[PDB]
């Protein structure tokens, strides 16, 4: 926008960077599409095929309503929306119910029996599309009419404006329809007190500072299930109270320390959701479990930061030795040991060793196998290699400190032979006692990195003075770090995910400005001054040269000179990089906590009551092509053959402060992908959270009992595999042991403490006082085994018997009612009775079918990131997956309130804070009786079809006999020179060979499995000839209500209704014979009658809103024509919370919320943002680099 070069006056804000949004979370649709729309089946005779034309100003409001409830509408149904639940998401809506092809299919059935389970899988994807409906409504093409152009029936309706897509709502039919009884019934309803229909601008929230309009609520024409979803997405975007200026907090973390960001101060007109803390840290623990290559990304983000900072540049000059000691004969044994260890300073791995220090460790690191002897006194080069690896990289020193003991115990057992024997009798490993003691093992074992995750520590690093080993312990005081412990103040203020309570990383060494002597360099003075005396004793004990001892000590103080020259650049410019790498997004674990003697990384696992637990940190040897092997020969290029941007002062350098946006955008594009990567895992395992079951029994304890009442009893092995692992999760005490003398108040003390009614049996004979308490409260008694279970109770009534029980299964969702652990709502309880018998291989097919449907938005790093991990997920069971710490022994600890973070207590099905709020609104859409049109139960009867309506359920006459169907009744018998299929009537015991003289039977078929085809012929032959009534309880079917002008299109044979698999989904067509043409009075009659074989049980057309919108020429209103229900025309108001209320029925009455009742309201106040908001833009800041790298403060603050 401006011109080069020499800093002209700019009276604006010197913008140099532009900031992306932190989360691409919302869609931004303008004209909202509802979840339920009207669908009208016109009667082709009475209707008029024109387009109705009112006044032109009224034609934009009333127009598409009077052209949908046009004169002649037979039925008006309320069905699912076609252009929201479109064919891109697999849902088919042709036959009325949602149908998904291959989501939850049963196995072991005949090839057509998967059709009935397409309804249950339909109700998952209808639940799933509402659950992932992140729409956010922006004010569309709203027009504003003149009041003197609208008729006065519309002027009392219209609130000052309206959207052009006005929708369809029968309240607009007031004084616009031709039908007179409809116009009376709507006007009588709309003049009630409890409803008041409106359309348009209701509320207008002016801004507090700018005084412009921000949030308006337009009374739309949309169902309350879609409108409650569109109001939850707005009540959390505006009441989050965080603007787009809090992206700057995410930039101060990813840029250098003590930098500044000025402007633009956009205010509250530009809101954005807060970067969600509880959902990103909960999904990184699955992404660290299922995809263990995730360390390869987070290191590579941190590697790309170090290489972009230009912090260490390798040079081609080697100063390992001082001047003319290289060539000096006595030092020929020493120069071979240094040159063998030291290795060329590759630029790629010095940047790796820096980035590994603040990276999260998922694969357990292990040391490169250093094969040295510790034979000559020139072998101190390996020990000086480990001191420099302990000072420079003390975090990565800790992760492989055990394998250094495997090297250094060869050192001490060859130079201090008596001191080693004193030390190794104490132990080579030690544990931690529970009270805080040190328990030394007393064994001589080689360390392995397998022991790094267990309770054993390396024993050189105990820092405990052994009485008699004061030399080995004094050398081990040189491996102490020289750093500090900085809190992550920039990450918590930016609300980044962390895995701790206090996020504290270990910066390796202090910023050291303004000093003459460097307090980090002088620490290395006292180490060499200690190491000079160690090599002094080893040289003079084994009587080597005077020159070989001098040329050793002349080398030990050449590392003194080279350490002083570069510690000015480590403690001023490396230490500010380890501070700003600690505040990154994906560097979430703690790495080190000061002391080598006590630290272990906090082992989180993904536990599961129905599977194994998968640990996060785990030695599996999965190399990332050089990541788990750690090279300790990297400290020799760092000390000698690298030039630093502050060791060079004398050339002009201009210390590089890298941009925030590269390590920010890579960190979002990982934390945005895995935020939704476990999302099809998170839905099927949420419906099936309580689908697990235990096997109990129920012993009847008195007379006149049923199968369910009594004492509920299960075995101890059934308890230990299912219920015990779900009580250590829910953080309750153990259930008590009842001993026979137990009072019923003690049992009430355990149920009110452990919130499930479970008590354990121990011994004794349980008295009759507690036995009545175990009956009237359904308390589950856990027995060891079923050996004479009457004798364990005091059977004083003498009615409880061993061989009197009903063994049945008991779901976990029946005994646990916890909010965020087991989904126990009334909607989800219905689905697990409609699902077929699932398995752990059908949930796997259900997850991979949802992920094929979901086409989520990635980026050019996303799919690359997504690919990287990148294919294995199906190993971990995700039944009730929680995040719990384990002991280093290997038992899963309970949730401790004061160690773990708040977001690990209840893993909320690994979902979003918003996505649960859309879910409870979605479960109200599934349990709605208006869309539950999967009809089960059907009736065969041979009545006449004279006055057809789909509601007609033919009543069984008074003289029939109820007969249960079995396979014992029908059998072949020689009757009259012909084998006839003979029915045997169960009460009278007689035999009936021919289907004409059979008695009047109300046969009820419950099973129809293994039913013969001749028997299935004889029953349908018995309906026609002998007038039976046959109920089939197996047939699932849909139903379209045909208009009498369209006629029946297809038919259902009687062969299909009797000979079919259990899971076939039929399609019956019923005729609403209300608008049939009455014939002329002089017409000679027709010949035959209209018969009808198949009838329903439960009332068809539960989705019917209006029926037969015509006027009758003799009577006032037609026979059976219904009015639209008075809740379909009530806008009501919008509450302060965000709930949709109806209109109040009287003064001082809070109106009924629209989700509490099951009636459908097709007009709602939807809060939508105006054009003055613009959520999700690219705001613009001024980044100002700090002046000097030596002026940047790190600690304390």
């Amino acid at each position: 926008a401006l011109h080069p070069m020499t800093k002209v006056i700019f009276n604006g804000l010197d913008v140099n960077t532009e900031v992306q949004p932190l989360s691409d979370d919302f869609k931004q649709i303008s004209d909202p599409k509802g979840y339920l729309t009207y669908s009208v089946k016109y009667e082709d005779q009475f209707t008029k095929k024109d387009k109705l034309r009112a006044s032109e100003a009224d034609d934009r409001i009333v127009g598409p309503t009077v052209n949908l409830f046009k004169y002649g509408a037979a039925v008006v149904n309320i069905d699912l929306n076609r252009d929201f639940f479109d064919t891109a998401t697999g849902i088919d809506l042709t036959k009325g119910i949602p149908l998904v092809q291959d989501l939850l299919v049963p196995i072991g059935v005949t090839a057509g029996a998967e059709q009935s389970a397409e309804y249950v899988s339909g109700l998952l994807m209808v639940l799933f599309k509402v659950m992932t409906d992140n729409r956010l409504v922006i004010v569309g093409e709203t027009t504003t009419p003149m009041s003197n152009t609208l008729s006065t029936v519309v002027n009392n309706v219209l609130r000052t404006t309206y959207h052009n897509n006005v929708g369809v709502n029968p309240a607009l039919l007031r004084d616009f329809t031709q039908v007179n009884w409809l116009n009376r019934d709507i006007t009588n309803m709309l003049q009630q007190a409890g409803t008041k229909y409106g359309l348009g601008l209701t509320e207008t929230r002016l801004d507090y500072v700018r005084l412009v309009k921000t949030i308006v609520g337009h009374a739309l024409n949309i169902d309350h299930f879609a409108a409650s979803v569109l109001n939850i997405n707005l009540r959390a975007l505006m009441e989050a109270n965080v603007t787009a200026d809090d992206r700057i907090k995410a930039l101060q973390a990813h840029s250098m320390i003590s930098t500044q960001f000025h402007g633009p101060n956009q205010g509250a007109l530009r809101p954005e959701l807060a970067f969600d803390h509880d959902h990103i840290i909960r999904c990184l623990m699955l992404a660290a479990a299922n995809y263990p290559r995730l360390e390869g990304i987070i290191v590579q983000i941190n590697t790309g930061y170090v290489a972009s900072a230009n912090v260490i540049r390798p040079v081609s000059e080697k100063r390992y030795f001082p001047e003319n000691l290289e060539q000096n004969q006595s030092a020929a044994r020493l120069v071979s040991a240094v040159k063998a260890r030291a290795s060329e300073a590759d630029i790629s791995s010095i940047h790796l060793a820096i980035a590994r220090e603040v990276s999260p460790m998922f694969n357990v690191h292990e040391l490169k196998k250093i094969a040295e002897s510790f034979e000559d006194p020139s072998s101190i080069v390996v020990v000086l290699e480990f001191i420099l690896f302990a000072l420079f990289f003390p975090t990565e020193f800790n992760r492989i400190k055990g394998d250094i003991q495997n090297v250094l115990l060869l050192f001490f057992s060859r130079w201090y032979p008596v001191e080693y024997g004193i030390f190794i009798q104490r132990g080579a490993t030690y544990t931690i006692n529970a009270a805080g003691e040190f328990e030394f093992s007393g064994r001589n074992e080689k360390w392995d990195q397998s022991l790094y995750l267990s309770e054993h520590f390396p024993a050189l690093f105990s820092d405990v003075p052994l009485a008699g080993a004061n030399t080995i312990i004094a050398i081990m005081r040189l491996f102490t770090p020289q750093g500090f412990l900085r809190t992550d103040d920039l990450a918590i203020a930016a609300n980044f995910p962390r895995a701790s309570r206090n996020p504290q990383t270990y910066i390796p060494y202090t910023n050291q400005r303004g000093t003459v002597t460097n307090e980090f360099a002088s620490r290395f003075r006292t180490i060499v001054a200690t190491l000079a005396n160690v090599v002094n004793e080893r040289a003079v004990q084994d009587d080597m040269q005077k020159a070989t001892r001098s040329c050793t000590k002349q080398w030990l103080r050449h590392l003194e000179t080279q350490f002083d020259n570069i510690a000015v650049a480590h403690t001023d410019h490396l230490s500010v990089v380890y501070a700003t790498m600690s505040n990154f997004m994906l560097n979430f674990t703690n790495n080190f906590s000061g002391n080598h003697a006590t630290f272990k990384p906090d082992q989180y696992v993904i536990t599961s009551p129905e599977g194994s637990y998968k640990p996060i940190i785990e030695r599996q040897g999965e190399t990332v092509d050089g990541l788990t092997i750690i090279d300790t020969s990297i400290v020799w290029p760092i000390l000698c053959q690298c030039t630093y941007p502050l060791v060079r002062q004398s050339i002009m350098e201009e210390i590089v402060y890298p941009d925030p946006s590269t390590t920010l955008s890579q960190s979002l594009s990982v934390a945005q992908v895995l935020s939704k990567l476990t999302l099809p895992d998170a839905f099927i395992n949420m419906i099936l959270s309580g689908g697990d079951s235990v096997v109990m029994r129920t012993y009847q304890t008195e007379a006149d009992d049923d199968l369910d009442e009594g004492i509920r009893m299960t075995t101890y092995d059934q308890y230990l595999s299912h219920i015990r692992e779900r009580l250590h999760i829910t953080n309750v005490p153990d259930p008590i042991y009842i001993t026979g003398a137990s009072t019923p108040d003690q049992i009430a003390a355990s149920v009110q403490a452990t919130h499930v009614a479970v008590v354990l049996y121990q011994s004794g004979v349980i008295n009759g006082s507690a036995s009545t308490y175990l009956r009237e409260n359904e308390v589950l008694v856990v027995m060891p085994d079923y050996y004479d279970v009457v004798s364990r109770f005091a059977n004083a009534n003498l009615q409880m018997n061993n061989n009197r029980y009903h063994e049945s299964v008991l779901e976990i969702a029946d005994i646990f009612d916890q909010a965020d652990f087991i989904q126990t709502s009334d909607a989800v309880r219905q689905l697990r009775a409609l699902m077929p018998t699932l398995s752990t291989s059908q949930i796997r097919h259900a997850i991979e079918r949802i992920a094929q449907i979901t086409d989520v938005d990635s980026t050019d790093y996303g799919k690359l990131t997504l690919r990287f991990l990148g294919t294995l997920t199906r190993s971990l069971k995700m039944q009730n997956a929680q995040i719990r710490r384990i002991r280093p022994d290997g038992t899963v600890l309970r949730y401790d309130d004061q160690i773990d973070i708040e977001a690990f207590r209840w893993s909320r099905y690994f979902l979003d804070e918003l996505r649960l709020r859309r879910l409870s609104v979605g479960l109200r859409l599934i349990t709605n009786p208006r869309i539950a049109r999967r009809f089960d139960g059907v009736r065969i009867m041979y009545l006449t079809d004279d006055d057809p309506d789909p509601d007609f359920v033919p009543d069984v006459p008074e003289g029939y006999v109820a007969v249960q169907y079995a396979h014992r009744l029908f059998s072949s018998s020689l009757a009259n020179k012909r084998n006839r299929v003979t029915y045997t009537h169960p009460p009278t015991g007689m035999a009936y060979p021919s289907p004409t003289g059979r008695p009047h039977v109300h046969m009820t078929i419950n099973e129809r499995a293994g039913m013969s085809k001749l028997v299935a012929d004889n029953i349908i032959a018995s309906v026609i000839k002998s007038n039976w009534v046959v109920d089939i309880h197996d047939i699932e079917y849909t139903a379209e209500v045909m208009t009498p002008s369209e006629g029946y299109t297809q038919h259902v044979d009687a062969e299909s209704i009797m000979t079919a698999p259990k899971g076939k989904l039929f399609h019956l067509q019923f005729m609403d014979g209300l608008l049939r043409p009455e014939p002329s009075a002089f017409d000679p009659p027709a010949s035959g009658e209209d018969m009808r074989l198949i009838y329903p049980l439960q009332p068809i057309s539960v989705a019917r809103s209006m029926r037969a919108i015509v006027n009758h020429n003799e009577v006032d209103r037609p026979r059976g024509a219904v009015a639209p229900s008075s809740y379909e025309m009530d806008t009501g108001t919008l509450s302060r919370n965000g709930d949709l209320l109806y209109s109040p029925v009287a003064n001082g009455q809070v109106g009924i919320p629209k989700l509490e009742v099951d009636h459908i309201s097709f007009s709602n106040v939807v809060s939508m943002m105006t054009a003055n908001i613009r959520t999700g833009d690219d705001m613009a800041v001024e980044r100002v680099n700090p002046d000097d790298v030596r002026a940047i403060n790190i600690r304390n603050a």
Binding site: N16, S308, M652, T859
Partner: protein
């Protein structure tokens, strides 16, 4: 960027990446293209290589090394007044994005900076270049997909012509969508190929052809044999073999995709044969094409002889790849056989059985087997010993130069004057290279065919076809240049004829 997008804007237009109209990044993309006019001059000054690229790369990438006898450090001094001119708080950064068309068009002076930069790499999904990354998303035109669900307004989805471009995924005509739906002033990305997501025996298989949706038929959910001939000529099945597509497989979905670019490492190997066919110097040039037994190349390189001979004005003839096996079965017994060219081609395809399919056929019996489903029951090392037994009847025709051996056949067919000037032999198994004669151009053909699926197809396949594909895959590794059958049809066209 490596190539600047304001002087060279059409290459980004080929990827679906249009330049945002003219601010802190609109100002920065003009700053980066000013460096390329400075940089390009410098590597003129001394041909080509700009001198000291290390202090060069520590200026663009890093806000670093201000510099002010001299002429050595002249181009550094002229540049330190150019990058300290515009006030940046950090460097500019690179942006190669991993594409053999894009990586080939990088000029010489940018590539010398790549050693000393740590450049930013943007991973191509299949091409298009896929739009994350504050570089690629704040510089120009994050696009908007326009599939069959998001219809039909720009006001509806809150788009703006200065920020978002539109990707046509309707199947409607292009001209109407910016006529009646209001997408005027909204510029549209142009893609001239398409991507097919087929059904498979194993799963969803995404292949691409460089034909538009109009140039071939098949929408949506037509089978695999409908317009099979155009898919073989132009397709890549971007999937790890075995992909598992079959003749009973259908289409799931179609979206227009970028025309993929042929293989600069595999264009030039095939370009040697398209030079040796032209020059009057080289007598009897020869193209050798290796593939699996079910790659379907005898139906393919029968028309590539028809594309080369009509362009060269010469006579070519392919030896049809099994003409050793068909011929040796006919005259095992005959002391003087006829090596003539017209006798070989009037003998094969198909009714004469192959000699190895006699030998393989006898062998499968000995470890008694006749069913393809019985072959799955056999497993690897018990299978592999059969392959080793199968080899020893191979080497008896490869070792010496007898009068019935393979070396004599591909010699005397290639020499004897009745043959065409430039025959194309095709070989099944590698280490037939000591037999085919004589060339500098051996390619390796990978077609759109799961070849073992086509051998359970073949429709008189049996186990004899399927044992030998398996035997030949054990003898044919990918130690030659993969050639991808649309690239041989591409190189005829590029070559400049007389």
């Amino acid at each position: 960027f490596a190539i600047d997008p304001l002087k060279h804007s059409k290459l980004y237009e080929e990827y679906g990446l249009y330049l945002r109209p003219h601010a802190p990044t609109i100002r920065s993309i003009k700053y980066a293209s000013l460096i390329h006019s400075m940089l390009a001059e410098h590597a003129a000054r001394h041909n080509g290589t700009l001198i000291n690229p290390r202090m060069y790369a520590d200026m663009i990438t890093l806000g670093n090394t201000k510099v002010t006898a001299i002429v050595t450090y002249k181009a550094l001094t002229e540049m330190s007044t150019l990058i300290e001119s515009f006030r940046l708080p950090s460097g500019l950064t690179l942006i190669i994005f991993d594409d053999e068309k894009y990586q080939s068009l990088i000029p010489n002076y940018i590539n010398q900076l790549i050693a000393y930069t740590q450049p930013h790499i943007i991973p191509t999904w299949q091409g298009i270049a896929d739009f994350s990354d504050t570089y690629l998303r704040s510089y120009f035109k994050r696009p908007f997909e326009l599939t069959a669900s998001n219809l039909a307004a720009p006001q509806k989805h809150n788009l703006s012509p200065m920020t978002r471009s539109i990707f046509n995924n309707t199947g409607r005509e292009d001209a109407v969508i910016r006529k009646l739906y209001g997408y005027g002033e909204y510029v549209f990305i142009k893609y001239e190929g398409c991507l097919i997501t087929w059904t498979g025996i194993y799963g969803e298989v995404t292949m691409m052809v460089n034909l538009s949706k109009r140039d071939l038929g098949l929408d949506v959910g037509d089978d695999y044999l409908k317009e099979y001939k155009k898919l073989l000529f132009y397709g890549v099945i971007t999937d790890a073999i075995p992909s598992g597509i079959s003749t009973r497989s259908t289409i799931m979905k179609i979206s227009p995709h970028k025309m993929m670019n042929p293989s600069g490492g595999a264009l030039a190997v095939l370009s040697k044969f398209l030079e040796a066919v032209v020059s009057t110097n080289v007598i009897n040039a020869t193209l050798v094409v290796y593939a699996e037994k079910g790659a379907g190349k005898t139906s393919f390189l029968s028309t590539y002889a028809e594309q080369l001979s009509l362009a060269s004005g010469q006579v070519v003839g392919h030896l049809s790849s099994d003409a050793y096996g068909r011929w040796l079965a006919k005259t095992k017994d005959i002391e003087e056989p006829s090596f003539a060219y017209d006798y070989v081609l009037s003998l094969d395809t198909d009714d004469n059985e192959s000699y190895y399919e006699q030998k393989a056929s006898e062998l499968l019996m000995s470890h008694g087997i006749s069913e393809v489903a019985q072959y799955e029951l056999l497993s690897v090392r018990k299978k592999i010993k059969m392959m080793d037994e199968m080899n020893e009847v191979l080497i008896a025709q490869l070792e010496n130069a007898d009068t019935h051996s393979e070396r004599n056949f591909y010699y005397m067919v290639s020499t004897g004057k009745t043959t065409p000037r430039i025959l194309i032999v095709e070989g099944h198994f590698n280490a037939q290279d000591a037999t085919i004669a004589r060339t500098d151009t051996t390619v390796l053909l990978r077609t759109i065919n799961d070849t073992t699926q086509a051998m359970r197809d073949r429709q008189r396949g049996g186990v004899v076809q399927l044992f030998l594909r398996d035997t030949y895959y054990r003898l044919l590794p990918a130690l030659h240049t993969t050639v991808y059958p649309f690239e041989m049809l591409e190189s005829i066209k590029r070559w400049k004829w007389v």
